[PDB]
RNA sequence: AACGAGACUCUGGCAUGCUAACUAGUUACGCGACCCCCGAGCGGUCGGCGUCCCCCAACUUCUUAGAGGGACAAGUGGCGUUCAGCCACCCGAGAUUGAGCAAUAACAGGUCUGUGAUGCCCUUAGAUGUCGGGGCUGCACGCGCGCUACACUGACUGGCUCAGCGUGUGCCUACCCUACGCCGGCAGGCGCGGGUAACCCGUUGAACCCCAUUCGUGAUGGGGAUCGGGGAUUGCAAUUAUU
């Protein structure tokens, strides 16, 4: 009984994880599997201890980002929320997958440091490909809801179905496709 | 007759202020006075925040004085006559001692 | 819908029947959000309804109820013109009205040149204010000779 | 002599000045104290006031 | 008997005390049902321990729950501390160490600050700036 | 006016106003042209 | 039912009707015109507001009795912009306050008590619950 | 980090050991008692520290020859 | 061998163990009182709700604050000229809490406008030692520290529910913090009480935040500069607008 628990409404049993590298980056089922995606966690204290935070968790901390919005936790909260009701609506499937798909579509694999207009091509670690992803997309949200009738609640939808199939409509893939462009001349 | 009579010590030093207050306890207990015990009340901090420099020149710090004032309470079931003998001994130190003739 | 005209007229101003009501008649000059409110309360409108909306007649009750405040018990610290100089009297002034109400006043304070009137005249700061660094209108000037 | 030889000091800067030095600029009113900020820092350890933070 | 105990939690200012007595499974904070406390946007997490650990081990036991000081979410964590620490409390004095130890190990196993208090406090202000680590502007020309 | 008296001959459109209202402290302002240091790039090396 | 086993918001609407349907509350003149307090832009958007003020006020004597109109002007408080400046926290309108509490003294549902201030009588108590199990029993429990 | 002993702490373990051998152990519990009625030693978090030196000079003694 | 470093002093986080409280509380009952029947079951012994009220009841968990306790790189595994130390982990309230104080030798650094600290120079009755009025706020222009915003992750109108640090009747010097009742849209006015303060303002009903409503991508119900008219309060006096 106590060992499932749905996080309001939705299964996590069910959700699949296809990126080998990613598998110990992205925290979903078993003991990360929690009520909501709000606790008091010290997760800053050393350096790999943020991979120990829910993958919903560290959205909603990354969406209360951009100046008047600082510290604002319970209402970003309800965003993730009826973002992941809509999710279900033009799907028809579990909101998680949506998530860990367009996670694994956005991080970049390959970058170009800079060394004096003048870089050179280097490999991306998978934490930092997991950071990337999450600033991508909620970044994308964020700049397509600032003079629209449109919600934030209905965008953030908008890009996390975009990014699952990679559709070059997002934000985040056309952003990890000019990255690797760039990169590729750098050799 | 007897009364219930009441004693208040004040001072900025506690362990002065501590030798003063067991030493009205014992006096008391030994002549069967039945003493209520010394009621802590909180203590008081005086703050005053000050500019260094005497002319408004240089990287601007400042300085951060206090004082803190610390206050007790004992009570006795007791004659008006003895009070006035047991309030006299070991208060040679510079503590603020004060009574009431009726406060219970 | 009934397909009613969207754009009137109604004291020599023009008013887009397209808002709702009680943000529609502020057009007028004299008329804030606070006074309008009021006095469609007074005229007895619904204020959900769009002011394209009103019939011929309910118009003419909101413009004779802006006209004359005091007769349809608006009190007298509602009133943008108080114990006016020259006649003693309480009333809105509205329209065109108002230009000319504050045109007199300047004029008035100029003919027997107090303070207030030389500073509206040379365009300098009225009420209290310092004049060192805001306000700046002019050129940039240059040091060289 | 004159009749006329004062004018009203019941508030401001008029009426309060330091107790050591006659000065008028930034005393202190808290507590009672109504001593100058520089006579202040001179007999603060006399008055009884320390510092630890 | 009087077969009762009374124990706290805490997080920032915030002091929350739980008293329970040998009853048929009531529980209230400052009088109210705790389905009605409310930021109900956190509502799951005052439910937590009875979800959990199930209904069956509360049915025994009546909790009043009062809580003051701190903030709206402070006082949430709290009263979430001082229900599953009465519980293991009352449990240990008057039942078996062995049920004590179920408890213990499924509580902390989900989540710890349901058993355990959390110790940050605010930083004072220091002069020269803002805040505790922020300064002023700094200038030169 | 702090060194001289103005002179007023009061019409009754003065009323209410106080007498200090008609007889000013200053002179209005007009700019001679800006000197040395008024300016960041006006500095002087001999 | 007791106040306290109910939500407080429907209760506030559910004894708001109860007051209005009576026609025993007296009502001011003014009450279409006044700005309600000091850091308002404008005035409320509902007709109704007066008996939502009195049914709010009764709701607060109930939980917290000896209040007076200094005291209701603090519970009616809120945040004023001042322009260009920072904003600050501003009370209540006194005269709205002080004519609400005479309106539900003409009620018979309160008195002035010994000491200072106001409280609820048994008659405006058992008014109060009666509609607390109304609001229960519209939710079909 | 650092948690290097100064000379205050390691030259007044070596007087100890030097003069009260027979009484010292491997526990720090008992050490800690030990050094308390020995020595007169100003503070609380300094006896602690000179008890925590002697205690890793007793495990080293056990093994073999310290200079000093 | 000496000073600086460190130790040292204040502060934060732990104690159901100690001392003990009508200027601090809890639990319980001799009980007493109002309201509800929703509850096995009645309008009850018994249930629910209380900053409703006595105790000549019991007590110290929650509040105050005195004494002691506790942490040492102490335990286990690696790495180290196997020393001095360094990395991970168990157990634990806790394995970097934050401030104060601070050496030798300097600077043509600032201050004579803090002083009855002070040398030399100047002035001293047509005074460079008191009253009346004005200025320090003047505005083509360049620069520095800041406040409010450009909106929908919003603005407006209702409803609900939570802090911590402090100050208070001025000792020449003449003023303090405020409950409650009444009059007024508001600022404000009158009456009558408490507090020299764990005792009275005060259970300090704080803002963002939380729940419901209206607007609809428009320099708009975003923004609120600039400016006209009227009313109170301080003061001996408000115009160059005190608030």
């Avoid at chain 5, 600050?113 to 200038?139: I, M, N």
């Avoid at chain 8, 027979?22 to 602690?48: M, Q, W, Y």
Wanted: proline share 4%.
């Amino acid at each position: 009984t106590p060992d499932i628990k749905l996080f309001g409404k939705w299964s996590t049993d069910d959700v699949q994880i296809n990126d080998i590298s990613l598998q110990d980056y992205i925290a979903v089922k078993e003991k990360y599997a929690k009520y909501l995606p709000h606790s008091a966690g010290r997760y800053a204290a050393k350096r790999f201890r943020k991979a120990q935070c829910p993958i919903v968790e560290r959205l909603t901390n990354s969406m209360m980002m951009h100046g008047r919005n600082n510290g604002k936790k319970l209402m970003t909260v309800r965003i993730v929320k009826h973002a992941f009701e809509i999710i279900h609506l033009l799907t028809g499937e579990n909101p998680l997958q949506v998530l860990v798909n367009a996670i694994i579509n956005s991080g970049p694999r390959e970058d170009s440091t800079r060394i004096g207009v003048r870089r050179q091509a280097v490999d991306v670690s998978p934490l930092r490909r997991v950071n990337q992803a999450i600033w991508l997309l909620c970044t994308g949200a964020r700049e397509a809801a600032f003079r629209n009738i449109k919600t934030i609640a209905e965008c953030l939808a908008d890009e996390l179905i975009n990014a699952a199939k990679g559709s070059s409509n997002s934000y985040a893939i056309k952003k990890k496709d000019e990255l690797e462009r760039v990169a590729k001349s750098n050799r | 007759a007897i009364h219930r009579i009441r004693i208040t010590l004040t001072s900025r030093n506690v362990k002065s202020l501590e030798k003063v207050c067991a030493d009205l306890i014992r006096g008391a207990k030994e002549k069967n006075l039945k003493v209520k015990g010394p009621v802590r009340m909180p203590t008081k901090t005086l703050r005053i925040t000050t500019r260094k420099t005497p002319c408004g020149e240089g990287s601007k710090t400042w300085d951060r004085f206090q004082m803190r004032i610390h206050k007790r309470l004992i009570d006795l079931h007791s004659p008006s006559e003895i009070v006035k003998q047991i309030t006299s001994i070991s208060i040679e130190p510079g503590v603020e001692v004060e009574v009431t003739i009726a406060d219970a | 819908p009934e397909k009613f005209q969207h754009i009137l007229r109604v004291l020599n101003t023009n008013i887009d029947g397209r808002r709702k009501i009680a943000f529609a008649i502020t057009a007028i000059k004299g008329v804030g959000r606070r006074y309008a409110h009021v006095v469609l309360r007074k005229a007895d409108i619904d204020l959900t309804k769009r002011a394209g909306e009103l019939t011929e007649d309910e118009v003419e009750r909101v413009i004779t109820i802006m006209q004359n405040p005091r007769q349809y018990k608006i009190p007298d610290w509602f009133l943008n013109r108080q114990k006016d100089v020259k006649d003693g009297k309480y009333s809105q002034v509205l329209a065109n009205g108002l230009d000319n109400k504050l045109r007199e006043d300047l004029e008035r304070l100029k003919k027997i040149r107090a303070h207030r009137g030389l500073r509206h005249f040379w365009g300098l700061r009225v009420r209290g204010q310092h004049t060192k660094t805001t306000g700046r209108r002019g050129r940039t000037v240059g040091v060289s000779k | 002599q004159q009749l006329y030889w004062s004018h009203p000091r019941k508030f401001g800067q008029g009426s309060r000045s330091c107790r050591v030095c006659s000065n008028r600029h930034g005393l202190i009113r808290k507590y009672g104290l109504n001593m100058c900020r520089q006579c202040f820092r001179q007999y603060a350890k006399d008055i009884g006031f320390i510092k630890l933070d | 008997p009087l077969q009762s105990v009374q124990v706290f939690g805490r997080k920032k200012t915030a002091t929350a005390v739980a008293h329970c007595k040998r009853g048929n499974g009531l529980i209230k904070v400052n009088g109210r049902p705790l389905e009605m406390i409310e930021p109900r946007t956190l509502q799951y997490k005052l439910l937590e321990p009875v979800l959990l650990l199930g209904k069956e081990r509360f049915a025994g036991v009546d909790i009043r729950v009062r809580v003051k000081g701190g903030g709206h979410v402070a006082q949430i964590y709290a009263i979430r501390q001082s229900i599953s620490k009465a519980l293991v409390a009352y449990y240990q004095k008057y039942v078996d160490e062995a049920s004590k130890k179920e408890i213990k190990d499924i509580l902390i196993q989900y989540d710890r600050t349901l058993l355990v208090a959390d110790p940050r406090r605010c930083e004072s202000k220091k002069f020269g700036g803002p805040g505790a680590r922020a300064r002023y502007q700094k200038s030169y020309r | 006016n702090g060194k001289t008296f103005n002179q007023v001959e009061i019409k009754p459109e003065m009323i209410g106003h106080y007498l200090g209202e008609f007889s000013i402290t200053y002179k209005p302002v007009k700019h001679g042209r800006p000197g040395i240091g008024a300016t960041h790039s006006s500095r002087f090396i001999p | 039912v007791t106040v306290k086993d109910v939500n407080q918001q429907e209760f506030v609407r559910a004894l708001a009707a109860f007051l209005k349907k009576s026609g025993k509350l007296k009502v001011p003149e003014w009450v279409d015109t006044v700005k309600l307090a000091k850091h308002k832009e404008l005035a409320p958007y509902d007709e109704n507001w007066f008996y939502t003020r009195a049914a709010s006020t009764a709701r607060h004597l109930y939980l917290r009795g000896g209040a007076g109109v200094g005291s209701m002007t603090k519970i009616y408080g809120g945040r004023q912009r001042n322009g260009v400046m920072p904003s600050h926290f501003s009370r209540g309108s006194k005269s709205v306050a002080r004519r609400v509490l005479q309106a539900l003294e003409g009620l018979k549902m309160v008195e002035k008590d010994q000491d200072w201030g106001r409280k609820l009588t048994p008659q405006g108590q058992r008014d109060l619950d009666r509609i607390a199990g109304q609001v229960a029993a519209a939710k079909k429990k | 980090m650092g948690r290097v002993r100064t000379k205050t702490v390691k030259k007044a373990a070596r007087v100890i050991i030097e003069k009260y051998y027979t009484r010292l152990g491997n526990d720090f519990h008992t050490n800690k008692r030990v050094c308390e009625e020995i020595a007169i030693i100003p503070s609380k978090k300094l006896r602690n520290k000179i008890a925590g030196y002697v205690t890793h000079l007793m495990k080293r003694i056990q093994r073999g020859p310290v200079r000093g």
